[PDB]
Amino acid sequence: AKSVYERLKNDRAPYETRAQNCAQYTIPSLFPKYQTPWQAVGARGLNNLASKLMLALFPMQTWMRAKVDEGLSMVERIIMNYIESNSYRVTLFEALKQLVVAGNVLLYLPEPEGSNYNPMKLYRLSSYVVQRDAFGNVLQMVTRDQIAFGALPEDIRKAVEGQGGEKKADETIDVYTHIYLDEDSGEYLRYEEVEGMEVQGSDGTYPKEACPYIPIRMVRLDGESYGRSYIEEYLGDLRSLENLQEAIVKMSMISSKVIGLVNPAGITQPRRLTKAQTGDFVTGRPEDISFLQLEKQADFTVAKAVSDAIEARLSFAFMLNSAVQRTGERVTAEEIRYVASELEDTLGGVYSILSQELQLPLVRVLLKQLQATQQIPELPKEAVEPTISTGL
Amino acid sequence: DLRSLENLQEAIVKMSMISSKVIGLVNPAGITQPRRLTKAQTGDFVTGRPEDISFLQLEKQADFTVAKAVSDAIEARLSFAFMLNSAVQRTGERVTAEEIRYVASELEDTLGGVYSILSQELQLPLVRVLLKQLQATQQIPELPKEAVEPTISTGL
Amino acid sequence: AKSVYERLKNDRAPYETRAQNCAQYTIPSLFPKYQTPWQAVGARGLNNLASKLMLALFPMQTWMRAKVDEGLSMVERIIMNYIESNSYRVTLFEALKQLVVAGNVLLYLPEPEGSNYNPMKLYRLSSYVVQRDAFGNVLQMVTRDQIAFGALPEDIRKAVEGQGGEKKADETIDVYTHIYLDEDSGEYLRYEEVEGMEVQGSDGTYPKEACPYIPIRMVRLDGESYGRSYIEEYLGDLRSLENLQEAIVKMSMISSKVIGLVNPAGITQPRRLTKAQTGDFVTGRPEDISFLQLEKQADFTVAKAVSDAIEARLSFAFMLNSAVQRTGERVTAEEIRYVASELEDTLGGVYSILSQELQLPLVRVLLKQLQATQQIPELPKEAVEPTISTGL
């Protein structure tokens, strides 16, 4: 399915350069095309956004939910035990950090295969494409990866590399992965594709609810698959801050220095002026030696005032500069509603959309995938596939 | 009023960026060269008359202040125009109990009858089409016969 | 395995010069390529970061965790007894200090061999390389060391130096150490390599969980093995502070001095001016003697204002300038959650990532390695290899 990616590459390339061009002025290297941001109020605002939203969506407390509901309690308390011991909060911080930059981070959550260390493989927008319908559901997802020499298992790599050729011992070849909705059936089919062909013995199917690959957006906009971010609407105000304060500091460094101008047709030499203990009296007219004195004290103040205006408005733009209850008591008890309502009132419906596009499908794929090799006995028959209540 | 704010602050920032830079003008008929001026550790003494090198100094500090004052006026009036800048009870307690009437009355007193019109053009027909459409394949048994199609009371 | 290091040297050299170039403006000599930093707000911010994070990750209190759980209590209270009497907090301060400069500090924790003094040998990024996969696990680690003459034990050194040659009595030869994941097996194999060959009788194996060599990062970034730091995104703002305040002080020292200029074609001599008790009247016109008076009082103020701006923003950047509860009462009781939440809200997910990449593998390798020569009887059979619950 290399041709599908190369065809609808044009369907993602407007979203690509927006994401990359809006990444540059707020974090160095979450998107390539060192080299530091010149001044970085956006870099702190972004991390504060992530640090608030991590406590907002799901804290350490119970977030996911007469004689029968004890079996409801165990199946929804075992998932929080599985969610920490596999280190989910390590990579979901990266996910949400990508979410408030680009717009569409994927979250691969592969099969357990025991009780080992299974990491949430993340993907960024320079690797995958999604097609959506008029109503707003997924149709097909085409992820790409580069693979090194020995990082792939050698189970398959004999036949796909037996076509001919002596290659370098770190040859980076691209591999693809496609999931698509069937024509007649409502199940999704998944497979990998290497070297421009199907793989030996890897094709699989998945039920209706729980896709193995969860796409996400942060602001919903119909008509197309992906979505925007609100740093895409503070982009120009941040761009003006960077292109202002670079000029501010590079003006300050020129103003600080002292290039003393001495007259050439005078009597004084600078060679005697260079050697000077304090107190001695060296010859020379007091007219010749002067200094640069470029004389912009008030002209700096307009730049510092406009910078203060941008600095103060970006402060309320990115949830920063807020006296809060970070002075907690050993746990976070009622904190998530305060921070959640404040980020709702400052950012848009991000606490609303991430409760039905992040809190929902992670719980669905982790109540499907974890129960494949079933590690907890479900006692009742009435609510074997119960509701999924997120957020509250 | 918003259009004037955009077409003002674009000029404000693009004035600030020109004022921040330093295009030092050196005289051409002088003795000083800029090539020696470019290389300068702090403290060394390089030749040259102190008349030739000057800077732009476009000199509008007070003329910026009228633009910043008119921007402050628009910024302060748009603040009350769009319900922003209001100390509220967003410091809630785990739920919203009595909050909806306070916010509703404040947006009524600031925006017009939007809380009135959206209680009879949004809260009403969504409830009507969701008490018709959901009961087509009926998922809850209606017990009484007296109020099978009852009233629709919205807002309050 | 000298050739493996010399091959993927290119895989680390972008991370090398970033770490070394970002070390220079914040601490003198945690990385070579005396010579003091010119002005050093970063040097204090870095040590305050370490001093907060040391109480954050693990204090003196119990951090690691009906009739059966007493045996859980002893095995997790003996490890805190072993963690102080071998002086771990001495070298882990160096480790975390390397962590918020470079990005990848290794923590060797060799075998006990009794109950002697066994030090956590630290490694820095100029000595070792790690390869990672697409999911994010380790594959191979190649550490380097230089060794002096008699510092190595002489158990082996006869055969490796019997190749021929009369060498200097402090000849620094490099030695290497490789650990790698097997092709078929899931155990790691470890060995040393001296002089470009295998060593006599030293090759060993290790179980699945507890690697003897624990790599670490501070901000997670997929696609490559190592990682960045947030001083890599305050680098330019700190660099401007150093290159500003060097000019500030070297302007102040020139402005303080007094090189009095006397006219040469006048009547006054400076030789009579040099000798002067207060009160006497010495001859001379009051036109000839003047002073330099370079006259930049307002031009200094723009440099001091821009320095104040950088100084105030770096203050909140490095957790400094925070009124806290360092006025404690004999112990730290509830303190670790306050400091932990504040550094979470200021630095990123460092308290999250170091609870699953520092607090986890140290506990795993110290519940594997300490129980080799087993010093505490495990009573129950149900939780002999129990869970590892970190952070909380």
Numbering used by the authors:
A (entry chain E), C (entry chain F): 13 to 45, 54 to 85, 104 to 430
B (entry chain D): 275 to 430
What text appears in the publication on this structure?
They are also critical components of the DNA-packaging complex and are involved in tail assembly. Here we report a number of crystal and high-resolution cryo-electron microscopy (cryo-EM) structures of the T7 bacteriophage portal (gp8). The structures show two conformations—open and closed—of the portal and suggest a possible mechanism of the channel valve that regulates DNA passage.
A second cryo-EM data set yielded a higher resolution map than the initial one used for phasing. This map at 4.1 Å resolution shows a different conformation of the 12mer portal (gp8open). The overall structure is similar to that already described (RMSD 1.03 Å), with the exception of the conformation of the channel α10 helix, which is kinked in the middle and deviates “upwards,” instead of pointing perpendicular toward the channel axis. The kink occurs at a region containing two adjacent glycine residues (G386 and G387), which provide the necessary flexibility to change the orientation of the N-terminal half of the helix. Therefore, two clearly different conformations in the T7 connector were defined: one closed (gp8closed) and the other open (gp8open). Although the first structure described in this work (gp8closed) would impede the DNA passage through it, the second structure (gp8open) would allow it.
